Amino acid sequence: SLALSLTADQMVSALLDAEPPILYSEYDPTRPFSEASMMGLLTNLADRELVHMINWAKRVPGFVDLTLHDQVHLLECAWLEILMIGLVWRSMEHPGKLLFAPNLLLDRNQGKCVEGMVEIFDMLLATSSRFRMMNLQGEEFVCLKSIILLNSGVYTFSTLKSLEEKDHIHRVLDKITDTLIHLMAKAGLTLQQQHQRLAQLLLILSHIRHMSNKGMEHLYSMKCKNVVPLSDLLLEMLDAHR
């Protein structure tokens, strides 16, 4: 595979090159919004982002090495974590706000619109603040996002065969770890600092998993309430989680 043959610089390059675009919402500051429209903006946007995410995943080193069934599984597990981390990344330069889209910046206040979306908002803002406190670099961000894709479903996958699928992922994962360390070393961090920062970055992934789980349940709730429109792709992703 090309994947395991990449230097750290080549890996960063690959990931940076693969970044999806920032999309616009349909928000209109002159139009009145309900709970079911504000949320509709967010789900419309997420649906459009998913299409780009799928194509981004294909460009993550190692990912197309996997069987189609395994790619499907990893994305079903990780999609909302990946959307969430992108949101937190965009929102870094906007303390107290979530930049869902360049034309859709939201306050905690405006987030009360949806029933109980407030808690999730607060968690996303805490994460954003955390990224700010750590001064997260774009290069570190793309590494973490690819880690989520590869890691999040890796323990929820048949035969001693389907076990080698899992083992290739661990090799790619190690390679991304190497890349993070290389980035920190070049930033002038001491070895103790490198290890500490690596841990700090990886521990954030646990909080992202948590937010994704909470969001997944709010999403299922919304579905049943059938007041806010959900796309077929989004519905299928939701179902993958039951």
Partner: peptide, 9 residues
């Protein structure tokens, strides 16, 4: 699955 499709196309 839509996702399965999009992953092929």
């Amino acid at each position: 699955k839509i996702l399965h499709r999009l992953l092929q196309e």
